[PDB]
Structure formats: C-alpha cells, structure tokens
Design a protein around this nucleic acid. Structure first.
Lengths: 97, 111, 89, 121, 100, 197, 79
RNA sequence: AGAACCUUACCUGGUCUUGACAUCCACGGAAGUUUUCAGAGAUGAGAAUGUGCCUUCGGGAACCGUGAGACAGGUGCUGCA
RNA sequence: CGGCCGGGAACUCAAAGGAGACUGCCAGUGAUAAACUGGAGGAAGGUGGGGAUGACGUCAAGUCAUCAUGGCCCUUACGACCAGGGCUACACACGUGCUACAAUGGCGCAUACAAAGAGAAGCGACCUCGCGAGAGCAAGCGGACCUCAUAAAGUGCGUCGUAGUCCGGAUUGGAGUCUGCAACUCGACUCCAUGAAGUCGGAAUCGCUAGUAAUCGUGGAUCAGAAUGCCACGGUGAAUACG
C-alpha cells in the first residue's frame, strides 16, 4: 500500500484510490488537485490537508468509520454532475459544514 | 432557411440538422465556401448564409433525399427482388442473423 | 566477415557444439572471437486435447531452438579446411 | 542497474548540483503527471544527498510508475555502491527495494489471468 | 478423412500443380490493368473455361495421415490429436510443457 | 482419472526424444510426414521382428535411423532410401534386458491374449519376469472386455514402487492395442528402472 | 466485385444471351451461375434463375440493369 | 485453430458401376502434349504429336483402356461390447 | 550531433554453466519433541510467486464421426461423381461476449511508453496517385539488423455543456477497395448521407482479494480471403479479507 507523500495524507491516498475507478491515476490526481484548488478558497485550519468535521458525519474501528464516511462522501459526490470537479467538493463542504 | 434553426451551436454541428448533410459533408461545404468551422450561427452574418444556401442546394436537400429513398425502395419492391421482398416483409437485407438478433428490424418484442 | 551460424535444440547440445566450433577456431587461429548467443524463438500454440466438448482442456507446448553464431575476420586456407573437415560471406 | 516490470534503467554518478536529464531530455519534459517527480523525489528527500551530486539516468521499456520504480531501484543501487552506511539507514526505514510484483500469465479457459468466466446452472 | 476424400485431396493438388502456371499468367494479366479491355475479357474467357478446381481457393490442406478437415496446422501438417500423441510419445524435437 | 505421459513430461528430463532434426516450417511438415510414413512402414513390415525404439537423426541432408531392440539377427535401408529423396543409413542397437522392454512385453501380452491365455496369468507372468530380472518398478494394465463379455474392466497389477509424481524417475510408459475377435484390448505398461537425473 | 474491373458475367450466360439474340426468343434463358451480375445487354429479357430446386423466370429491364442476379429469385421461405 | 462451389457427412436432377481409392489375370498401346464440338459440370466423339530406359525381342518396368471372379467403399447402426 | 562510423567489453541484452534462502540464527511459546509467533541478516522467511504435476474409483458420462475394432445392414448401393441450394433459414426463449446509455465525456491539433510473436508460390521499405478501403514501382529479409510497426489511454491547448445534446451506434441508400474462377442466399473494409433503440437495468445470478479485478491496445494460430471467438503479451492500476 503506497501513499502519496506529495501531500502526505494516507486518507487522501485512499480518497484518490476510491476515485481511481477504471485504474485512471493521473486523471484522479487532476480531480483531487481541482478539489484542493476549490478547497483553498477557505482552507480552514489545515482543512486543505486533513478533514476534521467530515469525520463525524450524519451517516456513521475508526478506520472502518472513516472508510464508510468516505464511501458516503464519494457516493453523494458522484450522484450528480454539472461541472462535477467542483460540484463534488461543493457537496463535500455542504455535508461537512 | 426554415429548417436547421438551432441556438448556441457551431456551424458544422448546426449544419448536421438538415436531412442530407452531417459532420464531414458540413466540413466539406464550409471548406468549399471558406467559412470558419467554430463560429456560432448567432455571430455568423447573413452574407455567408446566402452563399451557404446555394452551396448546400448544390447537393441533395431534405425533400429530394426523402423522395429519392422512397422511389428507390418502391422501385426495388415493384421489381420484386430478394431486397424488395425483405423490405416488404420487414427482414434485413445485408445478411444479418434473424434467429435471435434483428429485433430493431423486426419490430417490438411483443409475442 | 565470415559469419557461421548454428542451431540446436538442447542447451547442452548447443553449448558443446559452440565449444567444438571455438576449439577448432582456436586451432586454426586467425583471431576468432567467441560465440555469440542470440535470443531463441518461442513457438507456442495451444491445442484442444479431446475431440469433443472441453475448452479448459488445452496443453501448452514450448519450442526453444537455440541459434548462435561465430565470426571470422578473414577467411584463409586453414579456415576453409576447418570448414570442410549456415554460412554468410 | 535495476529493473521494474520489464523496464531497464541504467544510472551514472555525476556531481552537477541539480542536473537531472533522462534520455537527452529534462525530467519535466520527459516525465510528468506531477506524481513521477514526487515518487522519485521521495528517496531524494530523506537520505540520498539531494544536492552536491546528480545522476544521469536512461530507461528502456515500462510505462510511468514502472519506470519510476526502475529508476528508484537504480538510484538506490547507486547509493549502495557509493556507500554501505546510507544503504543500512535506508533499509532500517521503509525503503526495502526490489519488489517483485510483475503481471501474472494469462490462464487457459479463463477470460483473464485470475477471472473465471460466468456460468449459469 | 476417407480414402475417397484423400484421393480428392491428392487429385486436387495434382490438378493445381498442373494448371498453376496458366492460371498464374491469367491472374497476372487480370491484375495488370492499363489497357486491353478485350484482352481482359479473353483472360476471363480462359479463366472460366478453366474448371473451378486447381486453385488455392480449392486447396483446403487438411490432415495427411488422418485427413481431419478440422484442427490443422500448417507447421506440422497433421491433426491436433495426432500432434498431441506425437509430442506424447516423443518423436519430435522440443514440445515440452510450456510454463512461463 | 486422466494422468499425463511419463515420457511426454520427461522428454527433456531423463529420456530424450526419438527425433533430432531442425528445419523451417514447410520442411518440418514434409519431413514429419516422411518420418511418420517410414515409421509406420517399418512397424507394419517388421512387427514380428521385436522392434522397440526407432530414433531418427538428420544432421545435414542425411537420415540416420537407429533401431534400439533385442535379438538383432532378424533383418540381416532400402525402403527408406527409396521413399525418402535424401540418403539414409540404418543402425541396430542390440540393447540388453529383453524383459524390461515396454514394447516387447506389450507384444508378448498381446500375443498371449490372441492365443487366449488368461488375463491374471499373463499379468502375473509379466510382472514376475519383470521383477526377476532386477527391476525396481513395473505396472501393467489391461483395459477393455476382461473376458470378451459385455462388461469392460480395467485390471491393473503393481509391484515394488512405480512413482509418477517424481519427475526424476526413470519411468518408461507404452501403450499397445490388440485386435481380437471380441474387439480391441488396450494394454498400458509402466517400467520404473531407477532414480537418477 | 471490387467495382473497378469488368463486371463479372459468365461465359455460358454470355453465349446463351448471344443465342437468344440470334434465335432464342429470350424465353428459356436458364441460369445457374447467379453469381454473375448484369450489364446493359440484358434489357427486357426473361431469365430463369435456378435459385432453389428448379428454374423460375423473372423479367429483367432497364430499371434493374445494374444489380445482382441472385436478388430477383430468393431462396428463403416462411410458413 | 474458421461454410462462397471444397469443406459437405444433406436435398433437387443427370451419370458410372470390379468401381474414386489397394492388389491379381489376358490383350492393345511408351508415358505425355496441343486443341474443337454437345453440355451448368461430371461426361462422349474427334484432329495432330511424342514413341524412351532394357531388348529372353510369343516380351521386361511405372503408365492408359478393355472383361470377369475376389474384394473394395460406407461420416450407415450399436460407447448400454 | 544518426552509435553514424574508429574505439571499448565497462553496462544492458543474449544464451549457457553455477551461485543465491535451506527454520540458516536469536528470543519466546509449545509435553526439551513436532510445530508456531516476533526480530536481525537477507533481493526473496517461512513450500517467495506462477505454471506444470489429476490417487483408488464415481457418473454402464462423450466419442465405433478424427481414428482403431467385435457384431448388424447397403453392395447397379446407404458406393463413387457432378452443378444449384442448405449448414448463415425466424412466431419465440436461453447462453457467452462486444458497443453504449456520456462530462474521470466526445471531438480537433502536437506529443511520451513497450513486451511478445510472425514472415518468402510472403512481409513489404521508399516515392507517386487517392478524402479512402488501396493501386503502380520496388531494395531488404526464411530474419536481434528488413517488414508487420504509427500503440492508446496519459500529457499540453481548444470546443461545448447535462441534453438522446457534438455520447452511442443498429438499419438503410448512393459509390468505391481488397483477396478470391466467383462477394446475390454467402466476406471484410472504406467515402458521404440517415442516423434508431439505449438515459444505468426486476425477481435473481456470476467472477474477483492482488500491482489481481477494472480499463486500453498489440501479436499469433486457424485461413485464398473471411472472427466482438480462442490463445499469448504489454500500459495505468484500486478497495476489502473483523470472522
């Protein structure tokens, strides 16, 4: 299991892994980079790196808790399109805050 | 003219809407007429449209293509060949498999 | 200049063949360089075993024909004697 | 020299202070996708003498991450032939190299290497 | 795979070897199209007077010792079962259990 | 259920092939046809000559056929020189141990069956003569209509040690078919000599 | 056909059409090589194709001058 | 691990039946080659040419045709021999 | 400024002969035994991975249709031949794949990366013609050199924007190209036009735990030509295994 130490964040490695449907890694990296760009508008308190309020979600081991949380996040993200590479992070921030 | 009135589309994509000219034929017509391939019809002036009308009417038009297809199929049917017989009975002509496939040619799967 | 190619089936067979060739080459002299082994050609093809209904039953056959060659910088009378004791001029 | 999923990689030591050229081209021109540079920077960051010494690399075969792993094994073999203390310090951390994870041979009677076809009752 | 079928095969390859040359010249003057429409017509004339046999279109190249029309290879010239038995009893160089 | 050939899996392990010649594709095809035709011809003309092994070698435009067998004073290259368009020569290897020969014991079993000797007696005589010579393993098997009745059986006898999942085992296996008034009977014989590789 | 060379017509059909022009009256023009196409000498003829078991006559005119012979007589049937 | 006639083992009409394929007997002719007509082709009738290697030269040896007896052929049946 | 040649056998590659990991060592557990866990060394640590390797017998399972054979039958025949047709037919259902139902998407431009295999009664450089399937010319190569042979997803720019729309491609018409005596039942491909159904699938069911599945491409056998099939190879590359 290799991480992505460009940003560290093995949780974001899991995120790009579950966003790597059909094995497309560079495109999922572009997706998470657009997500980082749209997240740097606010950026919270290191919110562009880690997620604090997104852990205790409305639909809940802590590793399995985070796995179910990110699964629900990806589901509610890919549920709609309309410039998905911003609408997915829009749904993410709506579910988080 | 009357037909092919889209909104916020490029010229080559717009010219596809006429029954008888599509993507590559629109590209060839625009190359012969000297028209850009990316300009929308709303930004396009009528000075190119009056030439485009004759440039497309040089080739087959909607009604002419429809009546040509109709006269060809009725000609083949009245000749009574294998093509005409399969066109009358609703069977494919190019040697497709009517055992399980050719549902689009045969009709709805009611029985 | 003069390239002598040879082919065999067994690895020890092609090894002893090239050994005999390089031994008679060191005998005749003329500064013969060593053997040049080339990558073998693998001729694989699957065959249905039984003549009836069985698709998972297919064998795997391997062909490993070893093809090597040696070089001669200048052909001489002793080299042609060691020849007449594949050729490319 | 090292390899990774059928991708040969040859290395050469040359002190250049930031000169990384692969196949007579810069790394930013030849490689890219903003992940290969990072996965080859990952050994270069902790213990690898990032400056004061550079490495001329050539690659043959492979794709992107395969060539990245091949040149990573190449630079760690260059470090090993340079000295042994840094090799031991790399092996103490999570940098054990030569990971043999090649592609499995296609089987017979299957749709892929480890995929049995669908069968009904 | 019968004696009659192998007789048909050997007479087919014999007629092919006999009438190969004139059929080859006919195909050559058919492929060479620069002029001589009437000579092309006469080439088709001779090609139609030539029987339908004696051509690689007729050449089926089935098995030799068994005559099996299915499961043939142009490298060994026999059936799948016969080349399997040949590699089984071991009278052909190579053909080991391929394992890579 | 369905095992593999011992020789067919140990072609490049212990027991070598019976043909040594290289050629291109069509040359390999016609040469295979020629060698199979001359093998069938030699077998059907010397079936009573106790023929065991036919090995062919073609270095360069020359056939060398060696017959590994016992009792060599039966025949004495005419037929192979007439059929093949290249020069050919014959050799005869009078090998020892005439009882440890798979083709010879298959011929003897088929001859006893066509002479209507009992199956158990024939198998017992075969395995006893095989083990008395000084062998290590012998497995015989008769298949098909054990008595000419309407029920077919596969009676097999073993003795000593006949391994099959050991690839370094010097095991030779041979099949034979006898054409009798009750059909055909297929005999499979296994001879295990030693353990060296 | 490859549509550049001569449209293939069989020799026996050619000579039977010649005999029909001479004295054959164009009625009993039985054909078996339906693989041959048609070219403008077959206008208003009565050609009997051997599509199935016997020969069935079909009138061929200028509206079907460029076509194939096996079209005008089918080989398929429904209940 | 491959249907366009072949494959083809099948059906419509024409054929040959010691046979398409292996062998025996007696006779004639080396073998072979160009080519025309009836015909969808299989098939029948012609017109020229070649005539050898050995010669016990009433004939050897492959080859083509004629007549009969053996047989042959069968992808016809029985894996419940 | 092409490994192109001198030069070198350093390195890759090539095929050989060997070596390298065998519970080899330490601690603990375990009836000191067998055996297990952790750790160092080590490229590989507990048969490293994969293929191959199929027990006595079961289904009187399939094959006398590839073949071999006891018996039965045809033997002016069910035997040999010939042309056309069928094997590709179509009220319907089932099975295995492929293409999609698009926005990690389509299309336009430039461009990065192989393994493996095949080739002479063939592959085909290179030029010209052609929007094209391809045609004329033709050196090299039964071959690590010559040819197949331009890999694509990816990268960089642009176009639209959530619609059957620029997704998708069935069907049909006109015209061409290839092999093949011959392309209509009964081939493939291409130029243009038409562009349908399809908007994520019910009860239910199948495969998969690793650089495997998932996705994209290439080659080969078969074959005159004719595969979404089969057999191999490569590119990117997951999540889960508490039980």
């Amino acid at each position: 299991i290799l991480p992505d130490p460009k940003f560290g964040s093995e949780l974001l490695a899991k995120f790009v892994n579950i966003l790597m449907v059909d094995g497309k890694k560079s495109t999922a990296e572009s997706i998470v980079y657009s997500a980082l760009e749209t997240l740097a508008q606010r950026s919270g308190k290191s919110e562009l790196e880690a997620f604090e309020v997104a852990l205790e979600n409305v639909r809940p081991r802590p590793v399995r808790r985070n796995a179910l949380a990110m699964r629900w996040i990806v589901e509610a993200a890919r549920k709609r399109g309309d410039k998905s590479m911003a609408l997915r992070l829009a749904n993410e921030l709506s579910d988080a805050a | 003219a009357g037909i092919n009135i889209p909104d916020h589309k490029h010229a080559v994509i717009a010219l596809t809407s006429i029954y008888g000219v599509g993507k590559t034929r629109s590209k060839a017509i625009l190359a012969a007429a000297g028209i850009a391939e990316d300009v929308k019809i709303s930004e396009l002036s009528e000075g190119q449209i009056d030439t485009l009308r004759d440039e497309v009417a040089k080739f087959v038009v909607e009604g002419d293509l429809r009546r040509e297809i109709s006269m060809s199929i009725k000609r083949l049917m009245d000749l009574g060949c294998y093509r005409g017989l399969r066109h009358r009975r609703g069977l494919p002509v190019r040697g497709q498999r009517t055992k399980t496939n050719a549902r689009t040619r045969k009709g709805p799967r009611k029985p | 200049r003069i390239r002598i190619r040879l082919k065999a089936f067994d690895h020890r067979l092609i090894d002893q063949a090239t050994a005999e060739i390089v031994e008679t080459a060191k005998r005749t002299g003329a500064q013969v360089r060593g053997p040049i082994p080339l990558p073998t050609r693998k001729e694989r093809f699957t065959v249905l075993i039984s003549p009836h209904v069985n698709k998972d039953a297919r064998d795997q056959y391997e062909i490993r024909t070893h093809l090597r060659l040696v070089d001669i910088v200048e052909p001489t009378e002793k080299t042609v004697d060691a020849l007449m004791r594949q050729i490319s001029l | 020299t090292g390899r990774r999923k059928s991708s040969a990689a040859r290395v050469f030591i040359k002190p250049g202070n930031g000169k990384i050229v692969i196949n007579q081209r810069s790394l930013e021109q030849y490689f890219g996708r903003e992940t290969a540079r990072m996965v080859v920077r990952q050994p270069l960051e902790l213990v690898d003498m990032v400056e004061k010494l550079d490495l001329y690399i050539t690659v043959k075969g492979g794709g992107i991450s395969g060539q990245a792993g091949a040149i990573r094994h190449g630079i760690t073999r260059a470090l090993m032939e340079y000295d042994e203390s840094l090799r031991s310090e790399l092996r103490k951390a999570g940098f054990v190299t030569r990971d043999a994870r090649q592609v499995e041979r296609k089987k017979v009677g299957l749709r892929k290497a480890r995929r049995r076809p669908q069968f009904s009752k | 795979a019968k004696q009659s079928m192998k007789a048909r095969e050997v007479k087919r390859v014999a007629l092919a070897d006999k009438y190969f040359a004139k059929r080859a010249e006919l195909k050559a003057i058919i492929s060479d199209v620069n002029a001589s429409d009437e000579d092309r017509w006469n080439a088709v004339l001779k090609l139609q007077t030539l029987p339908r046999d004696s051509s690689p279109s007729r050449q089926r190249n089935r098995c030799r010792q068994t005559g099996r029309p299915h499961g043939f290879l142009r490298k060994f010239g026999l059936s799948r079962i016969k080349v399997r038995e040949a590699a089984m009893r071991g009278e052909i160089p190579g053909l080991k259990k391929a394992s890579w | 259920g369905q095992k593999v050939h011992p020789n067919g899996i140990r072609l490049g392990i212990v027991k070598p092939w019976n043909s040594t010649w290289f050629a291109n594709t069509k040359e390999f095809a016609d040469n295979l046809d020629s060698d199979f035709k001359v093998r069938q011809y030699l077998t059907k003309e010397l079936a009573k000559a106790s023929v065991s092994r036919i090995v062919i070698e073609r270095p360069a435009k020359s056939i060398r056929v060696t017959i590994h067998t016992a009792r060599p004073g039966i025949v004495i290259r005419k037929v192979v020189a007439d059929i093949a368009g290249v020069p050919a020569q014959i050799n005869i290897a009078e090998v020892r141990k005439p009882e440890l020969d798979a083709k010879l014991v298959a011929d003897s079993i088929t001859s006893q069956l066509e002479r209507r000797v009992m199956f158990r007696r024939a198998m017992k005589r075969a395995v006893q003569n095989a083990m008395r010579l000084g062998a290590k393993g012998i497995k015989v098997e008769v298949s098909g209509r054990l008595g000419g009745a309407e029920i077919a059986r596969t009676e097999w006898y073993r003795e000593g040690r006949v391994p099959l999942h050991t690839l370094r085992a010097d095991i030779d296996y041979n099949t034979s078919e006898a054409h009798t008034t009750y059909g055909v009977i297929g005999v499979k014989v296994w001879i295990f000599k030693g353990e060296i590789l | 056909r490859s549509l550049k060379k001569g449209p293939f017509i069989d020799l026996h059909l050619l000579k039977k059409v010649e005999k029909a022009v001479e004295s054959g009256d164009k009625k009993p023009l039985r054909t078996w090589s339906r693989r041959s196409t048609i070219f403008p000498n077959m206008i208003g003829l009565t050609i009997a194709v051997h599509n199935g078991r016997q020969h069935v006559p079909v009138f061929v005119t200028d509206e079907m001058v460029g076509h194939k012979l096996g079209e005008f007589a089918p080989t398929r049937t429904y209940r």
